[model samples]
Structure formats: C-alpha cells, structure tokens
Target: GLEKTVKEKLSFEGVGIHTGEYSKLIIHPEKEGTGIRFFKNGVYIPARHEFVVHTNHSTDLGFKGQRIKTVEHILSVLHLLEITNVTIEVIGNEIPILDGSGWEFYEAIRKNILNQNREIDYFVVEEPIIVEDEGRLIKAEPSDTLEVTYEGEFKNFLGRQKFTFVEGNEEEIVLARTFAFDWEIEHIKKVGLGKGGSLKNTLVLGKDKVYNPEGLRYENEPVRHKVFDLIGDLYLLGSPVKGKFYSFRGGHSLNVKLVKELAKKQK
Candidate 1:
C-alpha cells in the first residue's frame, strides 16, 4: 500500500441501503496530501471524524447543507489499496451500495487505481490501548506490521467464528458482504434505515439458513465482514495504522469509540 489514487475517473451508480435513493459517484485521483474528500452538492467533506454528523447503521459525513452516508465499503477499499489522496464526486447523499460488499469496489479500485510515490501516513500504536463496553472489546498494541484479529458469535447458523487479517491480504474477508437478520430487515427500515436492502446487496440470515439467494461467501463471512468494517473505522483516524488489533463482539459504535480514544491519545 502506497500513496495513490484512481488512474482515471470510475463511475458507479446504485441505490443506498438506507436512503433508497439512486446515487452516482465518480472516483478521481488527487494530488498528494489531498487525502480522502467527498465533493457533493457544491460542498467538500473530508473523510475525517470531525465532519462525522452521525454514526449508527453507517458513518455519515455532513456539512453546509450536504450529507453523505454509508461510506464504509468505498472507504475500506481506498484504505486497503493505500489510495489516500482522492476526491469522490457524488450526485446524492449516499454512496452506492454496489453488490452490498467491498469486493465490488475492491475490483474497481485495483483495476484502475494508480500508484503515486507520495508521502504516506501511518499511525503505529506504541502502547496497548483497550476499550470495552457491554461485551464488545477492541484493543490495539504495538506491532511490527498491521494485523486485525476479530472474534464474534451469532444466533443463526453462523455461530462462534473468528478471522484474522495480516497485511491486508484476505480477499475473502475484504470481499465479504455486510449482514443483517431476517427479523432485523423489516424493523430496521420501519424505524431506522436499510431502505435499499435486498438479498442482492446484503447477506440476510434466516431462522436456520441464509435467506439471501447466494449462501455465504465464506463459512466465517460475517466475522470477516466485521474486520472489514473495523479497518474502515480505524482509518477514520486519518492515517494508516501499524498496530495489531484484537476485537471481540465489536460493531460500529464500539469501533468508533475506540478510534476516538486513539485519536485523543495521538493528540
């Protein structure tokens, strides 16, 4: 992973899993130090936590009458590819939920992503930092390289799984799709979000089987997807990290809290 961007603008169009709005996006290369920025509706929003307007189903960046939602998949792709400086030209408030997994974006990024020998940012944790609440836990300790260890359990057929990522080579994990319970589908859209969710984009769990057309991409796909989200959440610190991360039963909220704690320590 090096400082880089897309070689040429690549376009993607789809509806948001939450907003249910058809959105268009074009990823473009940018000069060094440009970092990840979303240009939408006549405004520029940096992919930094300071601009994070909300964090629940997904991360939302907002400013000046502009908002963008569900940024994890694209952000995960960019972070892993080490494409730091880029601009996302957006046509709506949501990023397209292409294939409901990071692989779609991953393929597009690797296919057209450029390599720039510019300065890259990396944050290496020198001391062990641990954060836990309820049952979720995330801990990062000094390491020679980047590694992510995730462990989780579920009520469906996918139960008690763990996955580890070293140096970002786990395509099975990176490409894993986000998941939701069949019971969660209707209730989430009714009160909170997931307006664009379907079997096509999300891996839906049923009483004893996968409700989605395709089964799991991997036996431990759910936990792998958890690591995918963790990488994106950690990148919100605005730099690459060199610590080994150990997480248990963690999700968006817990991940964000631990990241903010790391940011404060960095300060």
Candidate 2:
C-alpha cells in the first residue's frame, strides 16, 4: 500500500517569524498519491525539486504568480515526521514564525496525525551531492542512514558553532532555535528584510550578550539553528533523502545547488 493521503486538515495562525506580519497557514488532507504542493490564494505550485529558488538567507519558492518565504523550517518538520502528501495553503507571503523553531509546527501537526494511505517514491542518495561557494562547501553522501553536520561562525557573541546528527536525531536538530546577530538585525530591517522578526520569536545575539530577556533555549542554540536550516534546504530534493550531509559556512543558495546537482545525477 502507498502512503499519500492525510486524515484531516490542520491549521495554525501567527505572525510571520521573519516578516512580523500575521498570516494563517493550513495543512489540508490530500488523496493518496498526491505529493506536497503550495496553494496561495488561487494559485497552485507543485512541490518539486526544480521549484526551489536560490537565495542567500532562506529557501524560497515562487510559482504561478505566488511566492513563499522562509519555507525551510516547516519543510524540515514535514520531512522529519514523514508527511509526504499534503496541501499547504497560506494567507500571506511567509509561514508563521513560531518561537523561531520547528517544534511548534511539529506539535501542531502531531496533534492531528494522519494514517498512511498510499505508497509513494523515495530517492535515497546513491552518491555524493556536493557544491561550493567562495570557500563555503556542502556535500551529501549516500548512507544507510540520514546524517547532517554543519558549521558556522559569527564574530560577535555567537563566534563559531558546529552540530552533528544521525537520522534518528532529526527531532533534536529541528528543535534548535534560529538566531540573528545584533548588527545584522538593523541592516536586515534597513533593507526591508526581517519584516516579521522579533526578539520574542528569535534568538538575537549582541556583542557578548543575548538580546532576548528569556535567554537561550539550548546552550548551543546557534549551531542548532544551522542544523535546522540544513534540514529545510535538503527538503528541496522533493523527497526524503537517505544520506549524510556536510555543510560548512553555507546558506540557502549553496544548499539548493547541491540538491539540484544530486537530482540531476539521479535522473
């Protein structure tokens, strides 16, 4: 039997984690064999490997006159939880920025579990998928299990951080919080970015201190966020991939390139 249909639709509404504007998102039940797709207003965009857009800050997708922003966190949760077929409809340009972590979305969906309905295809990486930008590098190697390793740096309080995880630890990786540096925040806002960002929903780090009054979610939150980003970028492959990923100082553009390269080879 193939697993494709969802039991029911699940819904959530909150401020866009990055844009700071309110939006509603609903995950609706789909018939067995229908893959994931995005519906905005009246437009429909199938979730495919080729639809992924190359961007610096976030994984973006634009199709049929509709655009979605900061999609990685939500996609990461879906992949980790094995939700293959569903229609995600959004009332705005971005998904809700819930607590700057994927856990909130996972919890919302988990409360509405779906029974498997149809079997679909899965592409386990048979060889390494690799890409580089400047000195940044990323690679996906075939493995019996899914693994991820990420490393990043910030000159301020964040300094440098690294993380590693096996497939079973996807939950741990997704729970890591997204973070931002103090200097970057002003510039991001100045550039009309961070339109949905807030100290309450994100970890804002300053020089030698954290800007959030609540403090850190985990001692190594910076590194964890990198893992979260990696999960979302990898999801662009359009299927749950079984492989080990290594990323060093990489962002969304480089990540999507690696996925596209792997997809090209797989075909």
Leading candidate by TM-score: 1
Q: Candidate 1 local accuracy as lDDT?
A: 0.84
Candidate 2: stretches off by over 4 Å: 1-5
The residue-by-residue lDDT of candidate 1 on 146-246, one tens digit each, is 79989997877777889999884858667789898888777888876898888888998886888876798888888889889888877778877678999
Clashes of each: 0, 10
lDDT of 2 by residue, 72-93 (tens): 8888888776787889998888
Reference-based lDDT, each prediction: 0.84, 0.77
**Model 2 — which ten-residue stretch has the worst lDDT?**
1-10
How many collisions between residues are there in candidate 1? Answer: 0
Point out where model 1 deviates above 4 Å: none
lDDT of 1 at 171: 82
